[PDB]
Design an enzyme around this catalytic site. Sequence first.
Site, PDB file in Angstrom:
ATOM      1  N   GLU A   1      24.117  -2.920 -41.871  1.00 35.88           N
ATOM      2  CA  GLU A   1      22.938  -3.782 -41.932  1.00 35.88           C
ATOM      3  C   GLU A   1      22.830  -4.588 -43.236  1.00 35.88           C
ATOM      4  O   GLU A   1      22.472  -5.772 -43.221  1.00 35.88           O
ATOM      5  CB  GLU A   1      21.677  -2.939 -41.783  1.00 35.88           C
ATOM      6  CG  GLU A   1      21.532  -2.302 -40.395  1.00 35.88           C
ATOM      7  CD  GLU A   1      21.093  -3.304 -39.332  1.00 35.88           C
ATOM      8  OE1 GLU A   1      20.914  -4.501 -39.678  1.00 35.88           O
ATOM      9  OE2 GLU A   1      20.913  -2.890 -38.167  1.00 35.88           O
TER      10      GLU A   1
ATOM     11  N   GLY B   1      14.886 -13.672 -37.619  1.00 35.94           N
ATOM     12  CA  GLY B   1      14.950 -14.779 -38.560  1.00 35.94           C
ATOM     13  C   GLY B   1      13.983 -14.595 -39.720  1.00 35.94           C
ATOM     14  O   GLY B   1      13.531 -15.579 -40.331  1.00 35.94           O
ATOM     15  N   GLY B   2      13.628 -13.334 -40.000  1.00 34.19           N
ATOM     16  CA  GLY B   2      12.698 -13.011 -41.085  1.00 34.19           C
ATOM     17  C   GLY B   2      11.291 -13.602 -40.960  1.00 34.19           C
ATOM     18  O   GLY B   2      10.622 -13.705 -41.939  1.00 34.19           O
TER      19      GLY B   2
ATOM     20  N   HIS C   1      24.544  -6.801 -39.654  1.00 33.95           N
ATOM     21  CA  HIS C   1      23.253  -7.202 -39.130  1.00 33.95           C
ATOM     22  C   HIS C   1      23.377  -8.399 -38.196  1.00 33.95           C
ATOM     23  O   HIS C   1      23.963  -9.383 -38.586  1.00 33.95           O
ATOM     24  CB  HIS C   1      22.373  -7.597 -40.332  1.00 33.95           C
ATOM     25  CG  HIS C   1      20.951  -7.883 -39.973  1.00 33.95           C
ATOM     26  ND1 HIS C   1      20.075  -6.898 -39.591  1.00 33.95           N
ATOM     27  CD2 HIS C   1      20.244  -9.038 -39.975  1.00 33.95           C
ATOM     28  CE1 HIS C   1      18.888  -7.433 -39.361  1.00 33.95           C
ATOM     29  NE2 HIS C   1      18.965  -8.733 -39.587  1.00 33.95           N
TER      30      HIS C   1
ATOM     31  N   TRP D   1      23.432 -19.225 -36.535  1.00 31.46           N
ATOM     32  CA  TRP D   1      21.999 -18.839 -36.610  1.00 31.46           C
ATOM     33  C   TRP D   1      21.016 -20.014 -36.817  1.00 31.46           C
ATOM     34  O   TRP D   1      19.768 -19.921 -36.548  1.00 31.46           O
ATOM     35  CB  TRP D   1      21.800 -17.754 -37.696  1.00 31.46           C
ATOM     36  CG  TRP D   1      22.712 -16.541 -37.529  1.00 31.46           C
ATOM     37  CD1 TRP D   1      23.768 -16.183 -38.320  1.00 31.46           C
ATOM     38  CD2 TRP D   1      22.667 -15.570 -36.467  1.00 31.46           C
ATOM     39  NE1 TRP D   1      24.367 -15.036 -37.836  1.00 31.46           N
ATOM     40  CE2 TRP D   1      23.703 -14.633 -36.706  1.00 31.46           C
ATOM     41  CE3 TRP D   1      21.811 -15.361 -35.372  1.00 31.46           C
ATOM     42  CZ2 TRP D   1      23.922 -13.512 -35.874  1.00 31.46           C
ATOM     43  CZ3 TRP D   1      22.029 -14.255 -34.539  1.00 31.46           C
ATOM     44  CH2 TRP D   1      23.082 -13.333 -34.807  1.00 31.46           C
TER      45      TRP D   1
ATOM     46  N   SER E   1      15.762  -7.654 -35.510  1.00 33.19           N
ATOM     47  CA  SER E   1      15.215  -7.798 -36.872  1.00 33.19           C
ATOM     48  C   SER E   1      13.716  -8.124 -36.828  1.00 33.19           C
ATOM     49  O   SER E   1      12.955  -7.320 -36.294  1.00 33.19           O
ATOM     50  CB  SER E   1      16.038  -8.802 -37.695  1.00 33.19           C
ATOM     51  OG  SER E   1      15.856  -8.987 -39.119  1.00 33.19           O
TER      52      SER E   1
END
Lengths: 524, 524
Positions: free
Chosen positions: B322, B113-114, B433, B79, B195
Amino acid sequence: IIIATKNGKVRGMQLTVFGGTVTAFLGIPYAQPPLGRLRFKKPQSLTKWSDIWNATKYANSCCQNIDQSFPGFHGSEMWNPNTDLSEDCLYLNVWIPAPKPKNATVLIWIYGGGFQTGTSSLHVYDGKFLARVERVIVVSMNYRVGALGFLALPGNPEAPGNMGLFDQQLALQWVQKNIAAFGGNPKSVTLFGESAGAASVSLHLLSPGSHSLFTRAILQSGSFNAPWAVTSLYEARNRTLNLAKLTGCSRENETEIIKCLRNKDPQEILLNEAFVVPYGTPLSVNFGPTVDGDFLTDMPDILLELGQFKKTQILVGVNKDEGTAFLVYGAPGFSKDNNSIITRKEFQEGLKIFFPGVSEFGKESILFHYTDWVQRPENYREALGDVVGDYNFICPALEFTKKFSEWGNNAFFYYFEHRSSKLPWPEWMGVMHGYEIEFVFGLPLERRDQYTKAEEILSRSIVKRWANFAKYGNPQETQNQSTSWPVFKSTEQKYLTLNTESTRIMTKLRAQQCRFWTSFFPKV
Amino acid sequence: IIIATKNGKVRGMQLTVFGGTVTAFLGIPYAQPPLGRLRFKKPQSLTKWSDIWNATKYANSCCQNIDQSFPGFHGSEMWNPNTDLSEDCLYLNVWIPAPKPKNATVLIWIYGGGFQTGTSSLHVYDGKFLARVERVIVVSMNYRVGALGFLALPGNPEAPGNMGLFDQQLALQWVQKNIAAFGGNPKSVTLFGESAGAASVSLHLLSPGSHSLFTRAILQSGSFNAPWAVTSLYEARNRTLNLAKLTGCSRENETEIIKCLRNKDPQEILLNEAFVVPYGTPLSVNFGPTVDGDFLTDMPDILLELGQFKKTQILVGVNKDEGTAFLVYGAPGFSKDNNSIITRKEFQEGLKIFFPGVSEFGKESILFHYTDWVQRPENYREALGDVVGDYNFICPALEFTKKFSEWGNNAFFYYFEHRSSKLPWPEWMGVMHGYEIEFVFGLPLERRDQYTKAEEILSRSIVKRWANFAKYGNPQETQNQSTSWPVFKSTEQKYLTLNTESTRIMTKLRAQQCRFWTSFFPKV
Ligand SMILES: *[C@@H]1O[C@H](CO[C@H]2O[C@@H](C)[C@@H](O)[C@@H](O)[C@@H]2O)[C@@H](O[C@@H]2O[C@H](CO)[C@@H](O)[C@H](O)[C@H]2NC(C)=O)[C@H](O)[C@H]1NC(C)=O
Ligand SMILES: *[C@@H]1O[C@H](CO[C@H]2O[C@@H](C)[C@@H](O)[C@@H](O)[C@@H]2O)[C@@H](O[C@@H]2O[C@H](CO)[C@@H](O)[C@H](O)[C@H]2NC(C)=O)[C@H](O)[C@H]1NC(C)=O
Ligand SMILES: *[C@@H]1O[C@H](CO)[C@@H](O[C@@H]2O[C@H](CO)[C@@H](O)[C@H](O)[C@H]2NC(C)=O)[C@H](O)[C@H]1NC(C)=O
Ligand SMILES: *[C@@H]1O[C@H](CO)[C@@H](O[C@@H]2O[C@H](CO)[C@@H](O)[C@H](O)[C@H]2NC(C)=O)[C@H](O)[C@H]1NC(C)=O
Ligand SMILES: *[C@@H]1O[C@H](CO)[C@@H](O)[C@H](O)[C@H]1NC(C)=O
Ligand SMILES: *[C@@H]1O[C@H](CO)[C@@H](O)[C@H](O)[C@H]1NC(C)=O
Ligand SMILES: *[C@@H]1O[C@H](CO)[C@@H](O)[C@H](O)[C@H]1NC(C)=O
Ligand SMILES: *[C@@H]1O[C@H](CO)[C@@H](O)[C@H](O)[C@H]1NC(C)=O
Ligand SMILES: *[C@@H]1O[C@H](CO)[C@@H](O)[C@H](O)[C@H]1NC(C)=O
Ligand SMILES: *[C@@H]1O[C@H](CO)[C@@H](O)[C@H](O)[C@H]1NC(C)=O
Ligand SMILES: [Cl-]
Ligand SMILES: [Cl-]
Ligand SMILES: [Cl-]
Ligand SMILES: [Cl-]
């Protein structure tokens, strides 16, 4: 005036009411006195007499503890027995119109009192006004209360449980057998009752043995799904055992406990009833209905959910301030003689009074639901009364009504929001539990009695709606351009308000509160 | 292969994929580099070049903090950015089928990635398989994240907020203007994202400026009503001020704060982002979307409730586990390297990690809902993951879907329940998730890659459903006797499960849990 019954002749008396006449038969026996070996047993059938039984005064009320919280105070003392207490209390009253009706609809009253107290002889239950004004017959009965009515050892016919409910049922049978002789129609019988009497009415809807003994039902401030109305088999055993202990009657043969208990003075049984639970509340029902496998064949919640009950019309309602009466019987900071402004901390203590065996999370969740204010000094005082009324009376009546109506039958729901001008309790207590009863029985139709004119008219209309419900299954008042009372259905949930100003059709009474009590709270 | 765009010529490269060819244009600029005076501002339009821009490799990723929790571990490091970080990061990628399509449907990927991390160049976002197998065009973009993307001082065009969402939007415009030159149809454009990328997609449905820039939308594990997705005006100010403080940029003129912040090294901004909140969680979104009065005209919950969004088909889904990914980033007793059996007390501590500013009653209510066991050693471990997944992803996606579908449009909901055979995280973490993404992009269609045959087939089918959704608004696989995917309607709430064994139509995913999060929890 003498009437021949299956068991013998009875003599009544004449009464003058509103320029007319009502015949009253006060105190007819309907079972063997439940004395000696019969104490704690189902009522036994009465053997015939000759000569004329004199039904000219109210009979003994059943043994019961009395409310001594407010001596000399009418608000409380109006509910205490007004006839000698005695185990020899299985009597009923009949009020008939004069002249004798031909085939009159019959209204059968079942009093409340938390299954621990009450009697048919209270002034507020006087059936003469109804008989005069609506030409119905009114019947009322005394039934055993407390341990003498409801002590249970499951399956044991020495103390089977539900004896007081069997008393009510034997009196319903007496009406089936005997009321045509009084000019009444056994095929047109409506039960009506308030609080525990309403819960009793709701259980007769579930009991197969009561199916054929009535036509329709009216439930005022009570139903069998209220949290106080049915004693678990677990609690009942424990309570019977505690009673045994407290009276020196602890034994090994269970039938030896009962035999011992049958030797105790009625008064020793009464004195010990309060203590059979470690912590009671002002709404404690120490000895009440159980699932006995006889009157009640399964947990009544299961019966209601699955449609196992008599299919007929119901009329159900509650009062605006059901919960207030109870706060002055143990909640800190409360008093009938001041405005009872309590603090957050008193509120919290009050929950502890009313929810004694409830988890701390259970209590904060009540607090959370009920203290989101829209501040005002009486916020906390008002919230506690609402907590008590919603949990104990309003949400259960509303749930009973939804579930019952889901099986096809017409149901009518009311919200009684009138405070009596004569109410002896303070204003902050508002529209109290028990205080629609005098409107239903037509007490305000008596002009001498000091009620307002608006109250006479409200009482007149209610009396007409109740009688129309009883006779025709539809609580309309059709003559005076009245609001039409819609059927209550589980979707729209229409109810009628009852008040002197303007009567309204409204929807979804206490929607937010009852979702809390009915869905969430039973989980804690 | 050279293509002329509105701004200049771009050169791509050829790629061999599955015995065929895909043309890739990796790293096309789509805005002015947001440097110097442009830092924190909305993206500015790019001026034309001459000569051929070489789009033959991925461009810089935006500045961002990196996950250093597990160095050398593929589960986490897959990620992290795989291209240099730079403020000069406003670039996009285009994958087109070969030979050049005539009017191909376009799929535009927005990474998650929030809103603090991510990049379009990850291996799991490689659009060549989709282009090869479905003859769609795939576009992906880098957009600013963290404070550089989302620092907000409401109304102040020096730092208006939502800049990263405006980056996404300018890239959608670039596609409108330029994709026909690549053989793509600007009238057949589907956004898809996971997300925060899914939450971003859901906000483009609400933004009037994005209305005409796309046709349909796919939301994988995210939506704008998730608790992490939108920063309140209140939090955003406080966070901008804390950033100011931490960097010696506290001032009086607000435009003097921004001017000062523009002189800081990108790396000093990044270092200070974590601390702008007193207590963060593993799901903290320090700098995210705000109601800026520009991209977002009102609180998005109000827009959704009242039907103010683009009327089109949506495809929405979540993964079975999740919440598990997050537990090893701060919850006591958890670890990717053991089975993470925690106790009641660790569970309670974990709630404190995930719900730091939540009342003690709020936390016990979670505990109450989630610890009624049907004991088993992993009860508590499993409950915490479910708490985290339901609250943060599943219940919000389900609520978004109900509310959106209530305005007439077709919606399709999936529950992805397949765990990758290659998953580097432990078994107890289950269907995590982020781990449907590689199935959506067709990575298992590559036979060299070590996935099972059942996984190839699952990926093949998903790829077909997504492409059919994009082209035709209906995520069916029509050729291989597949389960038909029913529309999701707020009454029946049918969803499709995605798994290698048997795919099912089921109803009311997490019904009991979501009633808790959606109705009750927002009150605490
Ligand atoms: C079942 O009954 C027991 C019996 O305890 C009771 O004894 C009775 C004769 C009476 O005086 C009553 O008030 C007394 O409590 C209950 O046990 C009691 O439980 C409470 C817990 O709060 C303790 O404080 C008491 O000390 C304890 N007594 C004994 C002897 O054990 C018990 O609570 C009850 N259980 C149910 C079903 O509620
Ligand atoms: C709004 O921000 C203040 C600012 O406090 C912060 O200062 C930053 C530069 C940063 O280092 C940050 O971690 C620090 O907390 C917050 O005030 C703090 O609140 C907590 C309450 O738990 C206290 O423990 C801190 O001591 C306190 N600091 C100060 C200076 O007041 C505040 O919590 C925050 N408010 C919001 C909107 O959440
Ligand atoms: C209403 O009356 C009650 C009872 O007389 C009052 O409650 C008492 O108040 C004081 C201190 O709070 C104590 O001496 C007693 O312990 C309380 N009794 C109970 C049962 O709580 C109350 O203060 C009065 N409140 C008013 C005037 O608002
Ligand atoms: C799984 O691993 C974690 C971390 O190594 C273990 O949690 C640690 O356990 C002991 C005592 O409980 C302490 O020394 C540490 O403080 C704990 N760390 C954390 C972050 O909680 C856990 O015990 C392991 N559990 C197993 C093997 O089931
Ligand atoms: C019943 O009442 C009648 C009528 O007054 C009376 O004559 C008779 O004696 C009574 N019977 C009693 C007192 O038992
Ligand atoms: C009373 O009315 C019922 C119908 O409810 C009828 O069947 C019965 O015979 C009537 N009895 C009379 C008038 O005696
Ligand atoms: C109808 O109203 C009249 C006055 O016009 C009143 O005398 C009568 O009691 C009313 N009837 C009912 C049943 O309310
Ligand atoms: C772009 O690529 C071409 C083709 O190989 C090359 O000849 C040209 O010099 C490149 N331009 C650069 C390096 O800027
Ligand atoms: C692409 O298809 C659209 C319909 O979605 C059509 O209007 C447009 O003209 C087409 N463009 C081509 C084939 O160049
Ligand atoms: C349909 O199944 C065949 C095998 O019979 C397979 O080769 C093909 O990939 C499948 N198509 C889709 C879209 O799943
Ligand atoms: Cl009200
Ligand atoms: Cl009216
Ligand atoms: Cl599951
Ligand atoms: Cl299938």
